[PDB]
Enzyme design. Structure first.
Site, short mmCIF file in Angstrom:
data_model
loop_
_atom_site.label_atom_id
_atom_site.label_comp_id
_atom_site.label_asym_id
_atom_site.label_seq_id
_atom_site.Cartn_x
_atom_site.Cartn_y
_atom_site.Cartn_z
N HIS B 41 15.85 14.66 41.41
CA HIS B 41 14.40 14.63 41.19
C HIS B 41 13.61 14.69 42.49
O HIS B 41 12.38 14.57 42.43
CB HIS B 41 13.99 13.40 40.37
CG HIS B 41 14.01 12.10 41.13
ND1 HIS B 41 13.03 11.76 42.04
CD2 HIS B 41 14.85 11.04 41.06
CE1 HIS B 41 13.29 10.56 42.53
NE2 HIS B 41 14.39 10.10 41.95
N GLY B 143 10.62 4.36 47.11
CA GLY B 143 11.29 5.01 48.21
C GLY B 143 12.71 4.57 48.44
O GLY B 143 13.33 5.01 49.41
N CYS B 145 15.19 5.21 46.28
CA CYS B 145 16.18 6.04 45.60
C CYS B 145 16.98 6.85 46.61
O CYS B 145 16.51 7.17 47.71
CB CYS B 145 15.54 6.93 44.53
SG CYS B 145 14.09 7.86 44.96
#
Ligand SMILES: *CC(=O)[C@H](C[C@@H]1CCNC1=O)NC(=O)[C@H](CC1CCCCC1)NC(=O)[C@@H](NC(=O)OCc1ccccc1)[C@@H](C)OC(C)(C)C
Ligand SMILES: *CC(=O)[C@H](C[C@@H]1CCNC1=O)NC(=O)[C@H](CC1CCCCC1)NC(=O)[C@@H](NC(=O)OCc1ccccc1)[C@@H](C)OC(C)(C)C
EC number: 3.4.19.12
Lengths: 306, 306
Positions: B41, B143, B145
């Site tokens: 993503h 932030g 991920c």
């Protein structure tokens, strides 16, 4: 979201750990530039531990009596000196992995990460606090002495603890990196005991703020309290006195959540007086006191290191 | 002595973390040899998150759309491919700090260390378990991920988790390093929920053994129980069923302490039926279920890594 007992990334310290062998004794050492720091009782033998005179024991040693191994590499000792209860072995090679660093002696209540090590090899990392009685509740086995405790600020490793011994209650005692014990303890195997401990009040309050930041408010109330009336209840439950200094430190957390520090104190008072009644806070059924106000801000805001 | 929620030393993984930027989205990536792994993503925009077709989104991108930064060094993307929900960016430089490693997909109940990261910079390390409902109770902010979970065996880093999202209850969901989610979750921002969780029975038992190894016996009793009669009480308290497999795994711990597994089960049954009555176990007022039998042996015996 979430709240965990978080340690600092340990890589900068892993690159510094070494094995130190002298006589039949092997422990861990810390290699920074061309010096290896380790506990001075590495020069003690199986009958030297009862009441040794370390100055007299050290004058009898030569450089080649000390075997230092960094990985599968022998380091050569070219000098040595004792500073308090730590021995400093000067070696002929500067550690290329030396991070930026400081040696700091911390106050009771402050927290740090411990890199537990055996034979110079890191085993695991966990977060600890210096208890008010100057012990730490660690996890340490035979051969762990010389493992260090540390904090990290930006790029700099502030070393604050070196492990030496276990006390009969299962808690642990050691020194700062300049060889000074925390607490009244001494490095000989005569009778010593921790002394009564107390709960780190300002830290419990910081952790209640962490809970509010993360969604819990169930323990709050509409009451307030004065610093003295709080401290009167705190004394009964074996809590440390909260000072005006502690109040100011909790300022940022108070302002981010909109709960005045003394209102949070009134909440703690009620929690102490009534218990938690089968409820939990941040996954805990006890009032947790090993997070500083700085720890909470760091984890609830995302501060990194490089 | 002592027992702590211990993470693995994180240095081998710190040397692998990088920043990945595409469009307005920045997250963490994992650099091993000449490949950077990160959540797919990263190619989504602020209106792509509702129901994206990632294959169609990916064909529209070029290599130069991906900014990869390792330290203050730009890495150059020379290829890309999608595997499940992870994107694999081939770069022109092999990571010199690549450790020995494996990608493993773990079973619910198993534990791992998480190196939480922001902008490619490690923030902290903590220990987690995969819950029976395939979420993890982490500590993660915007932030984070691309941060990974891992175990270490001797010299080898077994990566098992990459972080993707938070669910409404504050728990966390992600994938293995080959892009397959744990649990039923999908990487789009439509309604999803964790599903009811259960307590990891075999782990609670391992932790009761840790307590005995460390000096506590107060919770033991003279009773025994059968596996079925245990499981009958366990079901009532939302505990996972204990299998014969779990019994065999607890073998070493049973033999080291001299408490038969089913006797320890009879102890757990009494603890579940009566509560802890204001007592604690290993510093906890709750039955702790995020230590595996392997974790206990590792920490109560001193296994290192190199
Ligand atoms: C340096 C090490 O690797 C170990 C690590 C400890 C072993 C188990 N867990 C640990 O943290 N350190 C020692 O074993 C240490 C040896 C040095 C040698 C002499 C100079 C200082 C100690 N000994 C102990 O930790 C010892 N504690 C102790 O003697 O405390 C003083 C005392 C003596 C008698 C009665 C009360 C208090 C441990 C091993 O002994 C007990 C029984 C307290 C666990
Ligand atoms: C990748 C990241 O750095 C963040 C990290 C999370 C933010 C806060 N804590 C975290 O762990 N990940 C996201 O913000 C993630 C974005 C991607 C983009 C689309 C493909 C997968 C998610 N979003 C969320 O984590 C999001 N969760 C979510 O949408 O769950 C599905 C859902 C949607 C509506 C109702 C119920 C469930 C978070 C940010 O949203 C909530 C409100 C669940 C916290």
């Amino acid at each position: 979201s979430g709240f965990r007992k978080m340690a600092f990334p340990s890589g900068k310290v892993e690159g510094c750990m070494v094995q130190v062998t002298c006589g039949t004794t092997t422990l861990n050492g810390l290699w920074l530039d061309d010096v290896v720091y380790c506990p001075r009782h590495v020069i003690c033998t199986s009958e030297d531990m009862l009441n040794p005179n370390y100055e007299d024991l050290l004058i009898r040693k030569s450089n080649h009596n000390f075997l230092v191994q960094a990985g599968n590499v022998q380091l050569r000792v070219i000098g040595h000196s004792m500073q308090n209860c730590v021995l400093k072995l000067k070696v002929d090679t500067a550690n290329p992995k030396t991070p930026k660093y400081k040696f700091v002696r911390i106050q009771p209540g402050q927290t740090f990460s411990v890199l537990a090590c055996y034979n110079g090899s890191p085993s695991g990392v966990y977060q600890c606090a210096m208890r008010p009685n100057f012990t730490i509740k660690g996890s340490f086995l035979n051969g762990s002495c010389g493992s260090v405790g540390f904090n990290i600020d930006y790029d700099c490793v502030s070393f604050c603890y070196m492990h030496h011994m276990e006390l009969p209650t299962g808690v642990h005692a050691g020194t700062d990196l300049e060889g000074n014990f925390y607490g009244p303890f001494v490095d000989r195997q005569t009778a010593q005991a921790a002394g009564t401990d107390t709960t780190i009040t300002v830290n419990v309050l910081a952790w209640l703020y962490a809970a509010v930041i993360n969604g819990d408010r169930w323990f709050l109330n509409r009451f307030t309290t004065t610093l003295n009336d709080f401290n009167l209840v705190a004394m009964k439950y074996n809590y440390e006195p909260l000072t005006q200094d502690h109040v100011d430190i909790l300022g940022p957390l108070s302002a981010q959540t909109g709960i005045a520090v003394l209102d949070m104190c009134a909440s703690l008072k009620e929690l102490l007086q009534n218990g938690m009644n089968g409820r939990t806070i941040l996954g805990s059924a006890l009032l947790e006191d090993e997070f500083t106000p700085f720890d909470v801000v760091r984890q609830c805001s995302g501060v990194t290191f490089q």
